[PDB]
Design a protein around this ligand. Structure first.
Ligand SMILES: [Mn+2]
Ligand SMILES: [Mn+2]
Lengths: 114, 114
């Protein structure tokens, strides 16, 4: 049994073509878990995970702040206490339109990576 | 994409010998999920999920309050922002030793039910 403070995990700041202003923490990863993985994402004010898709699902829980969710033909801003399920191959992305950091847990099957 | 307020999902109170002072909400259940499910548990002050084991893992994230984790040979109390991975067949239980409600997300592979 691993019991850990999520904040104590070293984050990877993520800077790509599609991602900026985002830190990722892998809480429970591929070496720990037989089936799925748990990450914690922090998005800085104005941070972006642009639209993309992949052949595996996301189960997400919004932990802090107002999270803007990008969809194929629209967006929806939700907040802390919402859960989100993205089906395999469904176009999605995220953005922080607020002036404070937003946090969300994101879980994916091990096929998806980590 | 499902986007919903967790608190809007119908809670199942449980009042039995081994599991009491608990409310369970299935956020992403077996009709929605190809691989694993997402539940939210609220534990009232003094509530209890007694020690047990089963042949599937738990991945857990503590959302609010101070949660006491019962282990084979001990106990460890963690706070919101902590995560817990319980290995398959590992003895585990939970208790709320505080005077306020505790909330945690709990996910298991679909093999484990709901
Ligand atoms: Mn994605
Ligand atoms: Mn259990």
């Amino acid at each position: 049994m691993i019991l850990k403070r999520a904040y104590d995990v070293t984050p990877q700041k993520i800077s790509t073509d599609k991602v900026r202003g985002v830190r990722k923490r892998v809480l429970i990863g591929l070496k720990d878990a037989p089936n799925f993985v748990m990450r914690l994402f922090t998005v800085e004010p104005g941070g972006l995970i642009d639209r993309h898709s992949h052949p595996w699902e996301h189960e997400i829980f919004v932990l802090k702040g107002k999270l803007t969710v990008l969809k194929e033909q629209g967006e929806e801003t939700v907040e802390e206490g919402f859960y989100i399920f993205v089906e395999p191959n469904e176009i999605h992305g995220f953005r922080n339109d607020t002036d404070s950091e937003v946090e969300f847990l994101c879980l994916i099957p091990k096929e998806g990576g980590e």
